[PDB]
Design a protein around this motif. Structure first.
Motif, PDB file in Angstrom:
ATOM      1  N   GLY A 202       0.343  -1.254   0.009  1.00 18.79           N
ATOM      2  CA  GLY A 202      -0.143   0.004  -0.011  1.00 18.79           C
ATOM      3  C   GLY A 202       0.648   1.318   0.210  1.00 18.79           C
TER       4      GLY A 202
ATOM      5  N   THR B 199      -8.735  -9.723   3.146  1.00 15.93           N
ATOM      6  CA  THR B 199      -7.865  -8.597   2.366  1.00 15.93           C
ATOM      7  C   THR B 199      -6.420  -8.530   3.516  1.00 15.93           C
ATOM      8  N   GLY B 202      -3.635  -4.865   2.868  1.00 18.43           N
ATOM      9  CA  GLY B 202      -4.414  -3.288   2.494  1.00 18.43           C
ATOM     10  C   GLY B 202      -5.179  -3.545   1.073  1.00 18.43           C
ATOM     11  N   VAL B 203      -5.560  -5.114   0.604  1.00 17.69           N
ATOM     12  CA  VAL B 203      -4.919  -5.635  -0.719  1.00 17.69           C
ATOM     13  C   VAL B 203      -7.318  -6.661  -1.390  1.00 17.69           C
ATOM     14  N   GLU B 204      -7.333  -6.011  -1.392  1.00 19.63           N
ATOM     15  CA  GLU B 204      -9.035  -7.496  -1.027  1.00 19.63           C
ATOM     16  C   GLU B 204      -8.221  -8.389  -2.684  1.00 19.63           C
TER      17      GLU B 204
END
Lengths: 257, 257
Positions: A202, B199, B202-204
């Motif tokens: 991120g 998740t 921070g990533v789905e």
């Protein structure tokens, strides 16, 4: 129709030419030789090789001779008293698109042309040229500069870094060292980065996706007077300028096309 | 009031029944046997077991016999010439709520009913049925489909994958293999995923929180004619349809309630 043929390279005024014809490639190692006499020929190499699964390394050495005369045993044997060794290893990842290499070549050859703060060292006293300070190098049109400031030398190994961010800085080295009792070797590496953005976790981390490695080892004997090196530098840097038959391969499909 | 009792299963027209009564569980391994003769009984298992700290594995085997007559030594001994082995191992995590299993069962049993592209293989020539292509399987109301396209077979192991995302695809296998000199074994596994969202960082990331493992090993002898397998398939798939005493356990509290 034949590529990798007799080409042109290092020249000065109008007297002696240096047409470099082809010769060998055995086991993946290109090689170019010049005129009649091999002992006075200008050797040069070039080989493709993918180092791992995310990179592509290379090897382009260069041996620049001297048209001297070693008379040993009553015979005038035309042989070189020394030879150069411009060996540029360059790693280019698969992720790095076809728009990074074009600006990498003009950064390796476009790093030592004919007196740049790094190669002027290779042509004169100030092998730093400037009490070693913030200098200029690789540029294009008017947008981003590449001022290379100083940084380290620990244990005899010069080093230059550019702007704010180190992860995007242009590293370069330089070290004096006499190999034996009749020679003087050197080491001038060069790492050219990429102003990319590795977002992992991120965060946009400004880091280079790759770096260059223009490492030119040059051996200069004590017997070789102070009139050989001047013509050696313009033969190493004066070998890959911005499209020469050897460095045009470093800028396009053409290996020696 | 007693659960895990004499139940019903595989049937055809009106002649022979298959009431499967209870029998053993020693060391955590359920077992069901049918009528008078054990040598012609329909064995079936079932055992609860938490594999680690974030999962719950199971084991529901099934042996389908044959009402044949092995006359050896002048006596007509009513024994099965072969037996099935529908062993479905299913792993269900603790994180997976009580709304995943309901759609997992109808995906394991709801995978081989009585001719589906996977079990029609278990009932006829085209054990692929279709030159092996994109087929249909598990569905509910009108929203999400499960078209299972082809993918790999390396070293004799069929495999089917669904849509765009592999991390949410419905894997399935199938391989022919003669175990010895008087039998023919098989292997048809099945992994049913979950369209969840892990998740991490921070990533789905669209990935399955778990996967099924409906692995049915079936041994069919050479002596067993081409009239046993037809009634074997409807006994393996025709054993867990959508609530049978054995698979209703795979869809609710009822082990054999």
């Amino acid at each position: 129709a034949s590529n990798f043929t007799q080409f042109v390279l290092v020249d000065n005024g109008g007297t002696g030419d240096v047409t470099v014809a082809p010769s060998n490639f055995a086991n993946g190692v290109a090689e170019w030789i010049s005129s009649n006499s091999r002992s006075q020929a200008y050797k040069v190499t070039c080989s493709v090789r993918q180092s791992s699964a995310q990179n592509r390394k290379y090897t382009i050495k260069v041996e620049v001779p001297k048209v001297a005369t070693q008379t040993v045993g009553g015979v005038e044997l035309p042989v070189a008293a020394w030879r150069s060794y411009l060996n540029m290893e360059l790693t280019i990842p698969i992720f790095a698109t076809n728009s990074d290499c074009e600006l990498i070549v003009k950064a390796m050859q476009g790093l030592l042309k004919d007196g740049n703060p790094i190669p002027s060292a290779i042509a004169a006293n100030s092998g730093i040229y400037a009490n070693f300070t913030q200098f200029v190098l690789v540029d294009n049109g008017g947008t981003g500069d590449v001022t290379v400031a100083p940084s380290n030398f620990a244990n005899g190994v010069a080093e230059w870094i550019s702007s704010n961010s180190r992860s995007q800085a242009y590293k370069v080295t330089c070290s004096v060292r006499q190999s034996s009792a009749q020679n003087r070797k050197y080491t001038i590496k060069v790492e050219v980065p990429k102003v990319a953005t590795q977002t992992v976790g991120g965060v946009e981390l400004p880091v280079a996706a790759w770096r260059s490695y223009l490492n030119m080892e040059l051996t200069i004997p004590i017997f070789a007077t102070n009139s050989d090196c001047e013509l050696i530098v313009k033969a190493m840097q004066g070998l890959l300028k911005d499209g020469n038959p050897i460095p045009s391969a470093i800028a396009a499909n053409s290996g020696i096309y």
